[PDB]
Design an enzyme around this catalytic site. Structure first.
Site, mmCIF file in Angstrom:
data_model
loop_
_atom_site.group_PDB
_atom_site.id
_atom_site.type_symbol
_atom_site.label_atom_id
_atom_site.label_comp_id
_atom_site.label_asym_id
_atom_site.label_seq_id
_atom_site.Cartn_x
_atom_site.Cartn_y
_atom_site.Cartn_z
ATOM 1 N N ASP A 181 47.049 37.167 39.803
ATOM 2 C CA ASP A 181 46.600 38.460 39.336
ATOM 3 C C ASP A 181 46.720 39.561 40.393
ATOM 4 O OD1 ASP A 181 43.916 39.728 37.165
ATOM 5 O OD2 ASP A 181 45.949 40.397 37.707
ATOM 6 N N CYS A 215 49.209 39.193 29.872
ATOM 7 C CA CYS A 215 48.640 38.603 31.093
ATOM 8 C C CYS A 215 47.124 38.563 30.900
ATOM 9 C CB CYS A 215 49.065 39.379 32.362
ATOM 10 S SG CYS A 215 48.937 41.212 32.281
ATOM 11 N N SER A 216 46.381 39.112 31.864
ATOM 12 C CA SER A 216 44.915 39.246 31.664
ATOM 13 C C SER A 216 44.501 40.543 30.925
ATOM 14 C CB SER A 216 44.097 38.932 32.925
ATOM 15 O OG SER A 216 42.701 38.861 32.606
ATOM 16 N N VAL A 219 48.625 44.752 31.609
ATOM 17 C CA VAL A 219 49.164 45.965 32.249
ATOM 18 C C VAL A 219 50.034 45.600 33.460
ATOM 19 C CG1 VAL A 219 47.358 47.467 31.222
ATOM 20 C CG2 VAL A 219 47.033 46.742 33.544
ATOM 21 N N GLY A 220 49.511 44.843 34.409
ATOM 22 C CA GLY A 220 50.241 44.796 35.692
ATOM 23 C C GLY A 220 51.384 43.798 35.662
ATOM 24 N N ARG A 221 51.056 42.517 35.501
ATOM 25 C CA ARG A 221 52.058 41.451 35.422
ATOM 26 C C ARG A 221 52.864 41.459 34.125
ATOM 27 N NH1 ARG A 221 48.059 36.632 36.708
ATOM 28 N NH2 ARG A 221 46.623 37.851 35.321
HETATM 29 C C1 2UN Z 1 36.619 45.919 34.594
HETATM 30 O O1 2UN Z 1 37.962 45.561 34.954
HETATM 31 C C2 2UN Z 1 38.863 46.153 35.931
HETATM 32 O O2 2UN Z 1 38.420 47.163 36.469
HETATM 33 C C3 2UN Z 1 40.235 45.563 36.282
HETATM 34 C C4 2UN Z 1 40.088 44.326 37.175
HETATM 35 C C5 2UN Z 1 38.884 44.333 38.094
HETATM 36 C C6 2UN Z 1 39.036 44.699 39.438
HETATM 37 C C7 2UN Z 1 37.956 44.727 40.320
HETATM 38 C C8 2UN Z 1 36.705 44.391 39.814
HETATM 39 C C9 2UN Z 1 36.532 44.036 38.471
HETATM 40 C C10 2UN Z 1 37.623 43.992 37.606
HETATM 41 C C11 2UN Z 1 41.043 45.159 35.035
HETATM 42 C C12 2UN Z 1 42.394 44.510 35.297
HETATM 43 C C13 2UN Z 1 43.558 45.249 35.566
HETATM 44 C C14 2UN Z 1 44.778 44.624 35.823
HETATM 45 C C15 2UN Z 1 44.806 43.222 35.799
HETATM 46 N N1 2UN Z 1 45.959 42.549 36.012
HETATM 47 S S1 2UN Z 1 46.924 42.142 34.783
HETATM 48 O O3 2UN Z 1 46.268 41.066 34.012
HETATM 49 O O4 2UN Z 1 48.167 41.577 35.365
HETATM 50 O O5 2UN Z 1 47.267 43.368 34.012
HETATM 51 C C16 2UN Z 1 43.655 42.486 35.518
HETATM 52 C C17 2UN Z 1 42.443 43.120 35.282
HETATM 53 C C18 2UN Z 1 41.066 46.640 36.954
HETATM 54 O O6 2UN Z 1 41.601 46.451 38.034
HETATM 55 O O7 2UN Z 1 41.247 47.939 36.309
HETATM 56 C C19 2UN Z 1 42.142 48.954 36.769
#
Ligand code: 2UN
EC number: 3.1.3.48
Length: 278
Positions: A181, A215-216, A219-221
């Site tokens: 991730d 992905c999760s 968005v990113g992967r």
């Molecule tokens: C509440 O959730 C968030 O704020 C998250 C992940 C996150 C990060 C830090 C603390 C909590 C959650 C969400 C998130 C964004 C991108 C990914 N990666 S992805 O699955 O490849 O798209 C995963 C999770 C984020 O980065 O948003 C921009």
């Protein structure tokens, strides 16, 4: 700005420039994309009834581009590719409570191919529900019945085939299992060969709706997968490569596509290796 097209013969040097002074110009570049799409609202994903349907409360589809179920709410977005406007559906990793909606979406939208580029749990942090069956036993998801026909594990991805009975489709699921991730795979070659394998199956799926990629958060992967799918086709196809324009088009469709700069670097590295090798 929009598309920054690079001549194949110029790519290496151009990449070097962007790479100079601790990635200075690349940082500038990735930064121009920051505001793309930011005019768009997400009011539907914010409705009270939909709250439990989003895995992350700040990662929500634009109303203008969201996938509607035929209570129409799924956290999913249509995304253009090199070839057509609804080339992909991009979604979050299904939640225990949204997996029936996700399979309902796969059914209604005529999808034959699903690409998963997350593990369900990474190092203990939950990323995605295990939304397909453990093994060959069948399971219901809402009004659909699904059976896993086949599961081939490879070192870096697993290919499953599912049979869905609705209201006789074969669905292929392409699971890349070594993409951290917020990070990038340990090499360019692994993802390059995964994408080339996926594209090959998509090429052979006459009549298929959108390819699903998740992905999760979706968005990113997800976005890096698709930007790569798009650009490797340009490389075979064209005298130019448009990485900036790929990532730009993605962002017009869903927030944060290609979510870290290092994912943006990794895209440039993949093109460079494909071009060095050829
Ligand atoms: C509440 O959730 C968030 O704020 C998250 C992940 C996150 C990060 C830090 C603390 C909590 C959650 C969400 C998130 C964004 C991108 C990914 N990666 S992805 O699955 O490849 O798209 C995963 C999770 C984020 O980065 O948003 C921009």
């Amino acid at each position: 700005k929009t598309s920054c097209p690079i001549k194949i013969n110029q790519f290496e040097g151009h990449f070097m420039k962007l790479q100079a002074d601790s990635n200075y110009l690349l940082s500038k570049e990735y930064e121009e994309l920051k505001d793309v799409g930011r005019n768009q609202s997400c009011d539907i994903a914010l409705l009270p009834e939909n709250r439990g349907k989003n895995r992350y409360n700040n990662i929500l589809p634009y109303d203008a581009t969201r996938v509607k179920l035929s209570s129409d709410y799924i956290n999913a977005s249509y995304i253009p590719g090199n070839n057509f406007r609804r080339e992909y559906i991009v979604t979050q990793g299904p939640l225990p409570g949204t997996k029936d909606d996700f399979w309902k979406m796969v059914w209604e939208q005529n999808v034959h191919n699903i690409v998963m580029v997350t593990q369900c749990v990474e190092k203990g942090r939950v990323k995605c529900d295990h939304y397909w069956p453990a093994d060959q036993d069948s399971l219901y998801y809402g009004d659909l019945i699904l059976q896993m026909l086949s599961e081939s594990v490879l070192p870096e991805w697993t290919i499953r085939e599912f049979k869905i009975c609705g209201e006789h489709r074969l669905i292929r699921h392409f699971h890349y299992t070594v993409w951290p991730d917020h990070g990038v795979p340990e090499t360019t070659q692994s993802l390059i060969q995964f994408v080339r394998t996926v594209r090959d199956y998509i090429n052979r799926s006459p009549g298929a709706g959108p390819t699903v990629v998740h992905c999760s958060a979706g968005v990113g992967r997800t976005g890096t997968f698709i930007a790569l799918d798009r650009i490797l086709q340009q490389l075979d196809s064209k005298d130019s490569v448009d990485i900036y324009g790929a990532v730009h088009d993605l962002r017009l469709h869903r927030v944060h596509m290609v979510q870290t700069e290092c994912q943006y670097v990794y895209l440039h590295q993949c093109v460079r290796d494909v071009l060095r090798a050829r």
